[PDB]
């Protein structure tokens, strides 16, 4: 009857999601309501700033997207997906979109601020995580993917760079740039090279199974300290991914290796998460036998690593980036393209 409680939790979560999916929150703040403090991150799409909402004094991470760059990069549809989805979802290991708005030049997404840093920085410093440490994080992603997939969402960008550590040592998935709501197959080449399932590389038409492959990549990297498929250039990584070979460090437990062989499975009829038992082939695997799935959800397990608190607006867990100034044009750009934002 564990399974019946999960079903009804998920049915209730779908009614909650669909209301917001159908009637999206829109224009819920303005730039002028925020004091900009420091640039705390950038990707190849825009830039993220620590801001302070002046009316409440709360700190947030504000993603700024230049509409003209989104259009030139052909990321219109993905950006509409990203915001529509993130404003609709509600799960403990998903970063919260607090406000969104746009002006003549930019789109803005204001999310909860996580001063503890990304998993990526902690992993590189420490080298690798212990099996128990990796398992605590992996558990949160298993639940998160069970949630997302139940809403017909594919995530498509799992990696330590997209996982932030909150003040209890739990994680939040924090970038929804390539998330999509789709029934059936989708075809876009997207993701991060090290994490791409073979059916993406091969232009084959794919589904949520790509997320579970990616979870295998994450668990491997967390526990080894390096990815299962690495090379100096992407085409060399793809050749390795599509070969069907993986080698495991000698310190990997036999249960870990068996899990990973089932997730890093080129054969879609055999990949864990994509069989008739679904996510339960994972949650019941021997590597997960000590994981109390409900206690993880409720955040009652003691975290293996709590980042040291230094203030709600401290930025010492992020690198320094060059400051650039936000320029807002007196003419509206790309109005029609982003009307639903």
């Amino acid at each position: 009857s564990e399974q019946e409680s999960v079903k009804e939790f998920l049915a209730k979560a779908k009614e909650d999601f669909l209301k917001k999916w159908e009637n999206p929150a829109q224009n819920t703040a303005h730039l002028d309501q925020f004091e900009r403090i420091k640039t705390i991150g950038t990707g190849s799409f825009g830039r993220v700033m620590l801001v302070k909402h002046m009316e409440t004094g709360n700190h947030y991470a504000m993603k700024i997207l230049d509409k003209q760059k989104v259009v030139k990069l052909k990321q219109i549809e993905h950006t509409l997906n990203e915001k529509r989805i993130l404003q609709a979802v509600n799960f403990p290991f998903l970063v919260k979109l607090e406000f969104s708005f746009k002006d003549n030049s930019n789109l803005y997404m204001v999310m909860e601020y996580m001063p503890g840093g990304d998993m990526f920085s902690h992993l590189r410093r420490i080298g690798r995580f212990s099996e128990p440490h990796a398992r605590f994080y992996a558990a949160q992603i298993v639940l998160t993917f069970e949630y997302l997939h139940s809403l017909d969402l594919i995530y498509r960008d799992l990696k330590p760079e997209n996982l932030l550590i909150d003040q209890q040592g739990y994680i939040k998935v924090a970038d929804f740039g390539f998330a999509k709501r789709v029934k059936g197959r989708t075809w876009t080449l997207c993701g991060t090279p090290e994490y791409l399932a073979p059916e993406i590389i091969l232009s084959k038409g794919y589904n949520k199974a790509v997320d579970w492959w990616a979870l295998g990549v994450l668990i491997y990297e967390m526990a080894a300290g390096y990815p299962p498929f690495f090379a100096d250039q992407p085409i060399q990584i793809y050749e390795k991914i599509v070969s069907g070979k993986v080698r495991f460090p000698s310190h990997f437990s036999s249960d870990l290796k068996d899990l990973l062989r089932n997730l890093l499975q080129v054969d879609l009829t055999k990949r864990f998460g994509n069989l008739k038992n679904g996510v339960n082939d994972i949650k019941n695997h021997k590597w997960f036998a000590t994981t109390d799935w409900i206690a993880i959800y409720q955040r009652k397990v003691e975290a293996p690593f709590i980042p040291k608190f230094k203030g709600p607006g401290d930025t010492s867990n992020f690198d320094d980036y060059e400051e650039e100034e936000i320029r807002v044009s007196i003419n509206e750009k790309c109005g029609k393209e982003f009307s639903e934002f």
Binding site: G43, S44, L73, K74, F120, R124, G127, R128, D157, K159, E161, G177, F178, L189, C190, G191, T192, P193, E194, A224, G225, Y226, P227, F230, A231, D232, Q233, P234, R247, P249
Partner: peptide, 20 residues
Amino acid sequence: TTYADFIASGRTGRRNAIHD
């Protein structure tokens, strides 16, 4: 060691997603 190969490689920093 494989780990020494990784940390000397071209892709140890934050990795971007792929485009178009």
